[PDB]
Scaffold this active site. Structure first.
Site, PDB file in Angstrom:
ATOM      1  N   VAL A  68      -4.824  98.795 100.168  1.00  0.00           N
ATOM      2  CA  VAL A  68      -3.985  99.133 101.738  1.00  0.00           C
ATOM      3  C   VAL A  68      -3.403 100.176 102.355  1.00  0.00           C
ATOM      4  O   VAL A  68      -3.173 101.218 100.763  1.00  0.00           O
ATOM      5  CB  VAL A  68      -2.589  97.835 101.243  1.00  0.00           C
ATOM      6  CG1 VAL A  68      -2.095  98.428 102.647  1.00  0.00           C
ATOM      7  CG2 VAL A  68      -2.705  96.539 101.352  1.00  0.00           C
TER       8      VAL A  68
ATOM      9  N   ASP B 236      -0.047  80.836  99.775  1.00  0.00           N
ATOM     10  CA  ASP B 236       0.322  82.571  98.785  1.00  0.00           C
ATOM     11  C   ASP B 236       1.473  83.127  98.712  1.00  0.00           C
ATOM     12  O   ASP B 236       1.587  84.022  99.510  1.00  0.00           O
ATOM     13  CB  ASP B 236      -1.120  83.741  98.879  1.00  0.00           C
ATOM     14  CG  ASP B 236      -0.735  84.801  98.010  1.00  0.00           C
ATOM     15  OD1 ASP B 236      -0.411  84.055  96.087  1.00  0.00           O
ATOM     16  OD2 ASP B 236      -1.355  85.342  98.041  1.00  0.00           O
TER      17      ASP B 236
END
Ligand code: JRJ
Length: 328
Positions: free
Chosen positions: A52, A155
């Site tokens: 990321v 999640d």
């Protein structure tokens, strides 16, 4: 014999009347954008599936977040992409700004709207009772949307919840483990973080639904109002179910697996033992009592249940007295 099948008590046939193009992500066609429009500023972190980055869209000078995916199944990538596009514009859902080809990694890179986020480490030490109710309600709006759109996150955790505490903005992110719900379909039980895995995953029941997210949400709520992160802290998937059994009791656990005709792992015979169900007042003390209310305990109790069918739906949860205080 065979396990007893299950159905979602809400949004069961949402995808059954959607066109194939909606849920058939294997045949999806990715509309590629220009990678040159984005310049990588700094590396925010590395995941098990991607890296990321923080970047800048030099076409409009806007700040963005880039998710460079590591080499994984093409089917999985299109799944996250199709899900993000279907949920694009929804309440508190992270916005997929663009999809580009990274020249180095040779893998797709997902560009998201930027969020001035504070990590939940320092943040959960600064949240008031009101702040907790507020953000729980904002998450519920996000969960109820994707559930109504026939999508299952799988999640839900503090790390996947971005919060701009200044402007009080919330974004549910990381839809890489998300899936479309189809009635009667068996899914992979190996989803979500250990501490937020629902009992259905721990007893290896595959025909689950949207209610999986509600358990995860309950785990978050319990950690926040009791000041114990994580609330269920197992050292592995087997010990995880035991930690849950020490609070909810083992008798309701057997009722759960007997109802769905589930056989428990024989290795639980030497580690599970017998446990009574505890009252939620047990975990209340002078350091967290200001975050605790009767409505909170009742709401949490209706979230954390073995039977995934007896859990509050996202819509129902938003109707709970716990959110009467929240300003709308
Ligand atoms: N395989 C897991 C992917 C995430 C790994 N990771 C990221 C970080 C830094 C914190 N962070 N991640 C963000 C993401 Br993904 C988005 Br989209 C946005 Br918008 C923001 Br703001 C993020 N901040 N650590 N591990």
């Amino acid at each position: 014999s065979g396990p007893v099948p299950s159905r979602a008590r809400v949004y069961t046939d949402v995808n059954t009347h959607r066109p194939r193009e909606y849920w058939d992500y294997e045949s999806h066609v990715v509309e590629w954008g220009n990678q040159d429009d984005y310049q990588l500023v700094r590396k925010l972190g590395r995941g098990k599936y991607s890296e990321v980055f923080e970047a800048i869209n030099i076409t409009n000078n806007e700040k963005v977040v880039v998710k460079i995916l590591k080499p994984v199944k093409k089917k999985k990538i299109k799944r996250e992409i199709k899900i993000l596009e279907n949920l694009r514009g929804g309440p508190n859902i992270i916005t997929l700004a663009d999809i580009v080809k990274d020249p180095v990694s040779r893998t797709p890179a997902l560009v998201f709207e930027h969020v001035n986020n504070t990590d939940f480490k320092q943040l959960y030490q600064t949240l008031t009772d009101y702040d907790i109710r507020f953000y729980m309600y904002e998450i519920l709006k996000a969960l109820d949307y994707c559930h109504s759109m026939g999508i299952m996150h799988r999640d839900v955790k503090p790390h996947n919840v971005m919060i701009d505490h200044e402007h009080r903005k919330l974004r549910l992110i990381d839809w890489g483990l998300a899936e479309f719900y189809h009635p009667g379909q068996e899914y992979n039980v190996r989803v979500a973080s250990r501490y937020f895995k629902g009992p259905e995953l721990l007893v290896d029941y595959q025909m689950y639904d949207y209610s999986l997210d509600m358990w995860s949400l309950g785990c978050m709520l319990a950690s926040m109002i009791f000041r114990k992160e994580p609330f269920f802290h197992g050292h592995d998937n087997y010990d995880q179910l035991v930690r849950i059994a020490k609070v909810l009791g083992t008798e309701d656990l057997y009722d759960y697996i007997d109802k769905y005709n589930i056989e428990l792992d024989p290795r639980f015979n030497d580690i599970l033992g017998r446990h009574s169900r505890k009252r939620w007042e047990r975990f209340v003390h002078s350091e967290n009592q200001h975050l605790v209310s009767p409505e909170a305990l009742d709401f949490l109790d209706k979230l954390l249940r073995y039977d995934h069918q007896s859990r509050l739906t996202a819509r129902e949860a938003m109707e709970h007295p716990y959110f009467y205080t929240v300003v709308k």
